[PDB]
Amino acid sequence: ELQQNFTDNNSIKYTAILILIAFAFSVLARLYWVAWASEFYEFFFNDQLMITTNDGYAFAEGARDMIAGFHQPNDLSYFGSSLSTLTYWLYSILPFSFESIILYMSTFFASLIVVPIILIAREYKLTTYGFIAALLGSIANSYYNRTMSGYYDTDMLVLVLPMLILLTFIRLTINKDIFTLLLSPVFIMIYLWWYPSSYSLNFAMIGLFGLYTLVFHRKEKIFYLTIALMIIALSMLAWQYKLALIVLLFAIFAFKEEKINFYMIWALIFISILILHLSGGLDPVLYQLKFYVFKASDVQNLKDAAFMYFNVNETIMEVNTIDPEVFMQRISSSVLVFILSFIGFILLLKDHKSMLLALPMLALGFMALRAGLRFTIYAVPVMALGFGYFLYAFFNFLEKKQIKLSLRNKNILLILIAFFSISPALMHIYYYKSSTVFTSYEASILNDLKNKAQREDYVVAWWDYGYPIRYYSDVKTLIDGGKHLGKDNFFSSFVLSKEQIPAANMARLSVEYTEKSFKENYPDVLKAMVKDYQKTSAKDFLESLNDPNFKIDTPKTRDVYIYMPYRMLRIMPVVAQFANTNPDNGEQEKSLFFSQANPLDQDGSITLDNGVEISNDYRSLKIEGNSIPLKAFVDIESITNGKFYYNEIDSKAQIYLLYLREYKSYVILDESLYNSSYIQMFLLNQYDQDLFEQITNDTRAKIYRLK
Amino acid sequence: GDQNATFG
Ligand SMILES: CC(=O)N[C@@H]1[C@@H](O)[C@H](O)[C@@H](CO)O[C@@H]1CP(=O)(O)OP(=O)(O)OC/C=C(/C)CC/C=C(/C)CC/C=C(/C)CCC=C(C)C
Ligand SMILES: [Mn+2]
Ligand SMILES: [Mn+2]
Ligand code: NA
C-alpha cells in the first residue's frame, strides 16, 4: 500500500481523491471548535451556537431581511449583499435552521481553497506536493482565524477566488487553454460581486498579467484578448453588457480561425481602458492606500467641509500592527516553515515563471507589516505552494545526489514531514478557544429590546455593537463596523462619555440629524448641526449643549435608546478618546487616565494584571514605581440596585478606585471619566430620571430611553 | 485579533 509511487501521479482520479481528502481535513479541522464551544451555554442562541465575528451580523441582518422580504428605509441593512444573498439561497434550499447555516458556511466555502492549490500544483506536475500545500494552507494560523466555524464573513471566499484566477492564468500559459478566455473574466466578475474591495487586487493582477504578456507572450493574440475582456470585467458596466462582450468575443475567437485582427484588439484595449477609466479606475486603489498604507485622517478629502476627528485606524483590532515573528506565524504557523516556504517560493519562481503572476497576493500579505494583521491572509496559500515546492526540491535533491531511499521510506519521510510541519497549525486551532461576539444573555437582552422598540427607532451604542444590535433588535444605529470614521463615531463617543445633560441633548440631535442626512447628504453631520444653530465653531456649539435650558428645534420622529453593556468598560478610554478631540482643532483636550484589572488574589497589598499595586490601606496606588494618592474608593456591591460605598480618602487627590464585587474587578479612573454617562448610569445606576427611562436593568447591560 | 472591533 505504501510501496507505490505517489509523486509522479497526476491523474484526474488521484487528484479528485486528494481534493476530497484535503477538503474533509479542512472541515474536520474546524469542527474541533464546535465540539469545544458546544459545552458552554454562554455561546448559544435559538438552540445553536452564535456567530464569531462582529462583521457577520451585518450579512446576517441582510439575510434575515431578504428571507422576510423587506427591510426598513435607511437601516443600513446588507439586503442584497453577496454573502447575504448566498445565505438566502442556501436557507431556502436546505433543511437546517438559519443559525446553523450562518454558523457553517465559512467551514464549507473557505475549505474550497484546497481545490485551486492542488490544481495549480498539478499544472506543474506536482499534485502530491499540492496535497501537502493544501493541508498547510487551509488551516494556517491567520487563514484559520478568519474562516473558522462562526466566522460568518466575506473572508471565506476572499482567497479562493483570486487563487482560481491564478490557476486560470497558469492554464493559459501552459496549454493556451481557450476556456481561460471565458473563466478569467467570469471569475473576476464573481470576485467583484462577492467582495467589491477586491477591485485593488484585480487591478494589480490584470496589470501584471499585461506586463507579463508584453514579455513572455508578446505575440499571442489570446493573451491580449483575455486582457481586454478582463479589463471590461473590472469596469462598472451592467452585468448584461459585460457578459455580452465576454461571451460574444469568446465565441468569435473559439470558432473563428481568421479570427480578430491585431489592430482591432488594440482598439479593444483602448475602448476598455477608457471604460474602466470612466468607472473611476485607480481611484479606489489610491483611496485604499490612503487609508491603510499612509494612514491619513481626512481620507475623504474634505478640507473645511468637515471638522477634524480622531483617527479610527489605530483603534481597530484587525488593523493593529504585528511583529516579524507573529507575521511569520500568521502566514505559516511557524518561523521555520515560513523560511522554508519563502525559499521554496523563490525556487518555484525561478523554475516556473508563470508563478510570477502570484506576486500581487504575496505582496498584499507582506503589506500587513505596514497595514495591519488583517492582510497576512493574502500570502497564506501562495506561501503554502512555496512550501510544497521546497519539499519537491528537497527530494529532487536527494535523487540528484543519488541518496538510497526506498519508495516506502521516501513516503514515510514525506508523511512525517507534512505531519510535523502541519503540527503548529493544529496546535493553534486547539488553543484558539475563541468565543462568541456576545453572550446568550446579551443576545436575550437585545431580543427583548426587539419586542419593546420599533423598527424605526435608534439605539446609540459604540460601533463595535452596531451590527449585532441591529441583528438581535432590528433597530437603527448611528455607527457600525462599516460606518465608524471619526466624523461618524463622534456622536456616540460624546453620548457615552460626557455628562448626562449634554449627552441626552446629543442623543436626540445626533439621531435626528443622521435621519435628516439620508435626505440631505451632509458631508459632515456635526457641521450641519453647528451651521444650523447659528454657532461659530464646533467648540461653541458643543459647549452650548451643556445648558439645561437648551432649545431643541428638531421635532421627535422616533424613540432613542442608549445601550450600555458591561463589556464596554475596558475599552472606555478608547471610546472616550473620540469626543476628547476638539473638532475645530484635531487637538486632544484632556489626558484620560483609565484601566481595569483583576486581583491576582490577596495575602496584603493587591497586585492586579497591569502591575498596579493596590495599597493595603486602600488609600494609594503604585503604578510603575510611583505611588499616587486616591481621592476615593468606591466599593460597588450591586450594579443593578445601585448599592455602593463611596469612601472619601483625600479631597486633595484626583484618581478614583472602583471595586466591582459582582465581577471581582478593579477600575482606576479620573474625575472626567467617573462623571461620564456610562460610569454613572451603568456602574452606579445614577441617572437623571427626567432625562432617561430605564428599560433594561441588568448586571451585564443597561438600556435607557430618552424623553 | 481579527475583529472589526475596538482595542486599547
Ligand atoms: C460588513 C462590512 O462592514 N463591510 C464593509 C464594506 O461593505 C465596505 O465597503 C468596506 C469599506 O468601508 O469595509 C467593510 C468590508 P472590508 O473591511 O473587508 O473592506 P476594506 O476596508 O476595503 O479592506 C481593504 C482590504 C483590501 C484587501 C483592499 C485593498 C487594500 C489596499 C491597502 C490596496 C492594495 C493595492 C494594490 C495595488 C493591491 C496589491 C497589493 C500591493 C501591490 C501591495
Ligand atoms: Mn470583516
Ligand atoms: Mn430592519
Ligand atoms: Na459555563
mmCIF file with all atom_site columns, N, CA, C and O in Angstrom, chain A residues 16 33 91 102 117 138 158 165 239 248 257 274 318 362 377 380 382 410 442 451 514 563 593 612 623 661 673 694 703:
data_model
loop_
_atom_site.group_PDB
_atom_site.id
_atom_site.type_symbol
_atom_site.label_atom_id
_atom_site.label_alt_id
_atom_site.label_comp_id
_atom_site.label_asym_id
_atom_site.label_entity_id
_atom_site.label_seq_id
_atom_site.pdbx_PDB_ins_code
_atom_site.Cartn_x
_atom_site.Cartn_y
_atom_site.Cartn_z
_atom_site.occupancy
_atom_site.B_iso_or_equiv
_atom_site.pdbx_formal_charge
_atom_site.auth_seq_id
_atom_site.auth_comp_id
_atom_site.auth_asym_id
_atom_site.auth_atom_id
_atom_site.pdbx_PDB_model_num
ATOM 1   N N  . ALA A 1 16  ? -8.692  14.021 -7.745  1.00 0.00 ? 16  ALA A N  1
ATOM 2   C CA . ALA A 1 16  ? -10.005 14.125 -7.123  1.00 0.00 ? 16  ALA A CA 1
ATOM 3   C C  . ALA A 1 16  ? -9.988  13.525 -5.723  1.00 0.00 ? 16  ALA A C  1
ATOM 4   O O  . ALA A 1 16  ? -10.555 14.105 -4.786  1.00 0.00 ? 16  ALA A O  1
ATOM 5   N N  . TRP A 1 33  ? -13.527 23.311 17.216  1.00 0.00 ? 33  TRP A N  1
ATOM 6   C CA . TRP A 1 33  ? -14.068 24.417 17.991  1.00 0.00 ? 33  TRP A CA 1
ATOM 7   C C  . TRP A 1 33  ? -15.543 24.206 18.290  1.00 0.00 ? 33  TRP A C  1
ATOM 8   O O  . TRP A 1 33  ? -16.000 24.520 19.387  1.00 0.00 ? 33  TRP A O  1
ATOM 9   N N  . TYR A 1 91  ? -30.419 28.965 2.550   1.00 0.00 ? 91  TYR A N  1
ATOM 10  C CA . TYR A 1 91  ? -31.500 28.808 3.513   1.00 0.00 ? 91  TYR A CA 1
ATOM 11  C C  . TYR A 1 91  ? -32.774 28.305 2.850   1.00 0.00 ? 91  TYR A C  1
ATOM 12  O O  . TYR A 1 91  ? -33.460 27.442 3.405   1.00 0.00 ? 91  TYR A O  1
ATOM 13  N N  . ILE A 1 102 ? -25.609 29.899 8.907   1.00 0.00 ? 102 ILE A N  1
ATOM 14  C CA . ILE A 1 102 ? -24.737 31.035 9.149   1.00 0.00 ? 102 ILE A CA 1
ATOM 15  C C  . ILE A 1 102 ? -23.507 30.619 9.949   1.00 0.00 ? 102 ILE A C  1
ATOM 16  O O  . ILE A 1 102 ? -22.423 31.180 9.777   1.00 0.00 ? 102 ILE A O  1
ATOM 17  N N  . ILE A 1 117 ? -5.284  25.199 -4.897  1.00 0.00 ? 117 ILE A N  1
ATOM 18  C CA . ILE A 1 117 ? -3.903  24.958 -4.505  1.00 0.00 ? 117 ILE A CA 1
ATOM 19  C C  . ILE A 1 117 ? -3.376  23.720 -5.211  1.00 0.00 ? 117 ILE A C  1
ATOM 20  O O  . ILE A 1 117 ? -2.313  23.753 -5.847  1.00 0.00 ? 117 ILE A O  1
ATOM 21  N N  . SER A 1 138 ? -4.843  25.420 4.204   1.00 0.00 ? 138 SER A N  1
ATOM 22  C CA . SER A 1 138 ? -6.249  25.527 4.591   1.00 0.00 ? 138 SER A CA 1
ATOM 23  C C  . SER A 1 138 ? -6.432  25.828 6.069   1.00 0.00 ? 138 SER A C  1
ATOM 24  O O  . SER A 1 138 ? -7.486  26.341 6.458   1.00 0.00 ? 138 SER A O  1
ATOM 25  N N  . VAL A 1 158 ? -12.332 34.957 -0.036  1.00 0.00 ? 158 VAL A N  1
ATOM 26  C CA . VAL A 1 158 ? -11.581 36.129 -0.462  1.00 0.00 ? 158 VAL A CA 1
ATOM 27  C C  . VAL A 1 158 ? -10.192 35.747 -0.976  1.00 0.00 ? 158 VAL A C  1
ATOM 28  O O  . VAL A 1 158 ? -9.546  36.544 -1.671  1.00 0.00 ? 158 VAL A O  1
ATOM 29  N N  . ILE A 1 165 ? -8.474  32.493 -10.137 1.00 0.00 ? 165 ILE A N  1
ATOM 30  C CA . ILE A 1 165 ? -7.975  33.344 -11.215 1.00 0.00 ? 165 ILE A CA 1
ATOM 31  C C  . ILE A 1 165 ? -6.526  32.996 -11.544 1.00 0.00 ? 165 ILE A C  1
ATOM 32  O O  . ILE A 1 165 ? -6.159  32.879 -12.719 1.00 0.00 ? 165 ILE A O  1
ATOM 33  N N  . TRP A 1 239 ? -24.114 44.034 -15.781 1.00 0.00 ? 239 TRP A N  1
ATOM 34  C CA . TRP A 1 239 ? -23.653 42.666 -15.984 1.00 0.00 ? 239 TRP A CA 1
ATOM 35  C C  . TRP A 1 239 ? -24.008 42.149 -17.375 1.00 0.00 ? 239 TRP A C  1
ATOM 36  O O  . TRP A 1 239 ? -23.245 41.379 -17.965 1.00 0.00 ? 239 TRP A O  1
ATOM 37  N N  . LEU A 1 248 ? -19.607 36.993 -26.455 1.00 0.00 ? 248 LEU A N  1
ATOM 38  C CA . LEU A 1 248 ? -19.516 37.323 -27.879 1.00 0.00 ? 248 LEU A CA 1
ATOM 39  C C  . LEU A 1 248 ? -18.095 37.135 -28.403 1.00 0.00 ? 248 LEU A C  1
ATOM 40  O O  . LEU A 1 248 ? -17.839 36.302 -29.287 1.00 0.00 ? 248 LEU A O  1
ATOM 41  N N  . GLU A 1 257 ? -11.156 31.011 -37.138 1.00 0.00 ? 257 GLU A N  1
ATOM 42  C CA . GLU A 1 257 ? -9.714  30.881 -37.366 1.00 0.00 ? 257 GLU A CA 1
ATOM 43  C C  . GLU A 1 257 ? -9.107  32.086 -38.089 1.00 0.00 ? 257 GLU A C  1
ATOM 44  O O  . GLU A 1 257 ? -7.965  32.459 -37.793 1.00 0.00 ? 257 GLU A O  1
ATOM 45  N N  . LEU A 1 274 ? -10.520 53.090 -21.549 1.00 0.00 ? 274 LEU A N  1
ATOM 46  C CA . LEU A 1 274 ? -11.411 54.241 -21.436 1.00 0.00 ? 274 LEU A CA 1
ATOM 47  C C  . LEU A 1 274 ? -12.604 53.929 -20.531 1.00 0.00 ? 274 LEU A C  1
ATOM 48  O O  . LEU A 1 274 ? -12.982 54.739 -19.675 1.00 0.00 ? 274 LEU A O  1
ATOM 49  N N  . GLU A 1 318 ? -8.220  44.266 13.852  1.00 0.00 ? 318 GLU A N  1
ATOM 50  C CA . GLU A 1 318 ? -7.786  43.850 12.513  1.00 0.00 ? 318 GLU A CA 1
ATOM 51  C C  . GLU A 1 318 ? -6.626  44.631 11.906  1.00 0.00 ? 318 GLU A C  1
ATOM 52  O O  . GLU A 1 318 ? -5.820  44.072 11.165  1.00 0.00 ? 318 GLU A O  1
ATOM 53  N N  . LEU A 1 362 ? 1.009   37.685 -2.779  1.00 0.00 ? 362 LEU A N  1
ATOM 54  C CA . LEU A 1 362 ? 2.167   37.683 -1.893  1.00 0.00 ? 362 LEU A CA 1
ATOM 55  C C  . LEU A 1 362 ? 2.436   39.088 -1.373  1.00 0.00 ? 362 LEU A C  1
ATOM 56  O O  . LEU A 1 362 ? 2.470   39.317 -0.153  1.00 0.00 ? 362 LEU A O  1
ATOM 57  N N  . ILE A 1 377 ? -3.418  37.073 5.502   1.00 0.00 ? 377 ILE A N  1
ATOM 58  C CA . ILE A 1 377 ? -4.317  36.187 4.763   1.00 0.00 ? 377 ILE A CA 1
ATOM 59  C C  . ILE A 1 377 ? -3.884  36.043 3.298   1.00 0.00 ? 377 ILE A C  1
ATOM 60  O O  . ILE A 1 377 ? -3.683  34.921 2.811   1.00 0.00 ? 377 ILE A O  1
ATOM 61  N N  . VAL A 1 380 ? -1.062  33.485 2.479   1.00 0.00 ? 380 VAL A N  1
ATOM 62  C CA . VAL A 1 380 ? -1.099  32.130 3.042   1.00 0.00 ? 380 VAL A CA 1
ATOM 63  C C  . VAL A 1 380 ? -1.019  31.058 1.956   1.00 0.00 ? 380 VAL A C  1
ATOM 64  O O  . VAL A 1 380 ? -0.114  30.220 2.024   1.00 0.00 ? 380 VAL A O  1
ATOM 65  N N  . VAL A 1 382 ? -0.344  31.101 -1.497  1.00 0.00 ? 382 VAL A N  1
ATOM 66  C CA . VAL A 1 382 ? 0.889   31.236 -2.274  1.00 0.00 ? 382 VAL A CA 1
ATOM 67  C C  . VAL A 1 382 ? 2.062   30.634 -1.507  1.00 0.00 ? 382 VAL A C  1
ATOM 68  O O  . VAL A 1 382 ? 2.772   29.750 -2.008  1.00 0.00 ? 382 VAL A O  1
ATOM 69  N N  . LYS A 1 410 ? 10.884  7.019  1.332   1.00 0.00 ? 410 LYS A N  1
ATOM 70  C CA . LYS A 1 410 ? 10.601  8.375  0.874   1.00 0.00 ? 410 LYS A CA 1
ATOM 71  C C  . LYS A 1 410 ? 9.195   8.798  1.281   1.00 0.00 ? 410 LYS A C  1
ATOM 72  O O  . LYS A 1 410 ? 8.971   9.943  1.691   1.00 0.00 ? 410 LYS A O  1
ATOM 73  N N  . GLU A 1 442 ? -26.604 38.618 26.550  1.00 0.00 ? 442 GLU A N  1
ATOM 74  C CA . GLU A 1 442 ? -26.701 39.866 25.797  1.00 0.00 ? 442 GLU A CA 1
ATOM 75  C C  . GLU A 1 442 ? -27.648 39.717 24.614  1.00 0.00 ? 442 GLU A C  1
ATOM 76  O O  . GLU A 1 442 ? -28.445 40.619 24.334  1.00 0.00 ? 442 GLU A O  1
ATOM 77  N N  . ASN A 1 451 ? -38.611 43.183 20.944  1.00 0.00 ? 451 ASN A N  1
ATOM 78  C CA . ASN A 1 451 ? -40.053 43.191 21.215  1.00 0.00 ? 451 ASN A CA 1
ATOM 79  C C  . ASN A 1 451 ? -40.531 44.441 21.945  1.00 0.00 ? 451 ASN A C  1
ATOM 80  O O  . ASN A 1 451 ? -41.746 44.614 22.077  1.00 0.00 ? 451 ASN A O  1
ATOM 81  N N  . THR A 1 514 ? -28.809 62.459 11.767  1.00 0.00 ? 514 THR A N  1
ATOM 82  C CA . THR A 1 514 ? -28.493 61.315 10.918  1.00 0.00 ? 514 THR A CA 1
ATOM 83  C C  . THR A 1 514 ? -29.658 61.005 9.991   1.00 0.00 ? 514 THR A C  1
ATOM 84  O O  . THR A 1 514 ? -29.514 60.945 8.752   1.00 0.00 ? 514 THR A O  1
ATOM 85  N N  . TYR A 1 563 ? -27.535 52.028 24.684  1.00 0.00 ? 563 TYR A N  1
ATOM 86  C CA . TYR A 1 563 ? -27.162 50.672 25.080  1.00 0.00 ? 563 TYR A CA 1
ATOM 87  C C  . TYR A 1 563 ? -25.835 50.726 25.801  1.00 0.00 ? 563 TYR A C  1
ATOM 88  O O  . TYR A 1 563 ? -24.862 51.239 25.246  1.00 0.00 ? 563 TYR A O  1
ATOM 89  N N  . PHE A 1 593 ? -7.152  59.056 32.155  1.00 0.00 ? 593 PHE A N  1
ATOM 90  C CA . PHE A 1 593 ? -6.477  58.059 32.973  1.00 0.00 ? 593 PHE A CA 1
ATOM 91  C C  . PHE A 1 593 ? -7.475  56.945 33.250  1.00 0.00 ? 593 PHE A C  1
ATOM 92  O O  . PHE A 1 593 ? -8.524  57.199 33.851  1.00 0.00 ? 593 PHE A O  1
ATOM 93  N N  . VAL A 1 612 ? -0.255  47.142 38.712  1.00 0.00 ? 612 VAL A N  1
ATOM 94  C CA . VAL A 1 612 ? -0.602  48.212 39.640  1.00 0.00 ? 612 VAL A CA 1
ATOM 95  C C  . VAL A 1 612 ? -0.820  47.613 41.028  1.00 0.00 ? 612 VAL A C  1
ATOM 96  O O  . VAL A 1 612 ? -1.795  46.898 41.256  1.00 0.00 ? 612 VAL A O  1
ATOM 97  N N  . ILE A 1 623 ? 1.818   52.653 40.510  1.00 0.00 ? 623 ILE A N  1
ATOM 98  C CA . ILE A 1 623 ? 1.983   52.396 39.090  1.00 0.00 ? 623 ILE A CA 1
ATOM 99  C C  . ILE A 1 623 ? 3.419   52.710 38.719  1.00 0.00 ? 623 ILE A C  1
ATOM 100 O O  . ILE A 1 623 ? 3.901   53.818 38.980  1.00 0.00 ? 623 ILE A O  1
ATOM 101 N N  . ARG A 1 661 ? -17.684 44.194 42.936  1.00 0.00 ? 661 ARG A N  1
ATOM 102 C CA . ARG A 1 661 ? -17.846 42.927 43.645  1.00 0.00 ? 661 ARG A CA 1
ATOM 103 C C  . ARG A 1 661 ? -18.442 41.867 42.732  1.00 0.00 ? 661 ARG A C  1
ATOM 104 O O  . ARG A 1 661 ? -17.948 40.736 42.670  1.00 0.00 ? 661 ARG A O  1
ATOM 105 N N  . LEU A 1 673 ? -13.742 60.803 33.628  1.00 0.00 ? 673 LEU A N  1
ATOM 106 C CA . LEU A 1 673 ? -14.391 59.555 33.245  1.00 0.00 ? 673 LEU A CA 1
ATOM 107 C C  . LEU A 1 673 ? -15.381 59.074 34.305  1.00 0.00 ? 673 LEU A C  1
ATOM 108 O O  . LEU A 1 673 ? -16.385 58.436 33.969  1.00 0.00 ? 673 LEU A O  1
ATOM 109 N N  . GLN A 1 694 ? -35.254 54.014 32.311  1.00 0.00 ? 694 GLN A N  1
ATOM 110 C CA . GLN A 1 694 ? -34.543 52.748 32.321  1.00 0.00 ? 694 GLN A CA 1
ATOM 111 C C  . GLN A 1 694 ? -35.459 51.671 31.763  1.00 0.00 ? 694 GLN A C  1
ATOM 112 O O  . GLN A 1 694 ? -36.575 51.476 32.252  1.00 0.00 ? 694 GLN A O  1
ATOM 113 N N  . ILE A 1 703 ? -30.254 49.363 29.298  1.00 0.00 ? 703 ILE A N  1
ATOM 114 C CA . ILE A 1 703 ? -30.818 50.091 28.167  1.00 0.00 ? 703 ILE A CA 1
ATOM 115 C C  . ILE A 1 703 ? -31.672 51.223 28.714  1.00 0.00 ? 703 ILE A C  1
ATOM 116 O O  . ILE A 1 703 ? -32.615 50.977 29.479  1.00 0.00 ? 703 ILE A O  1
#
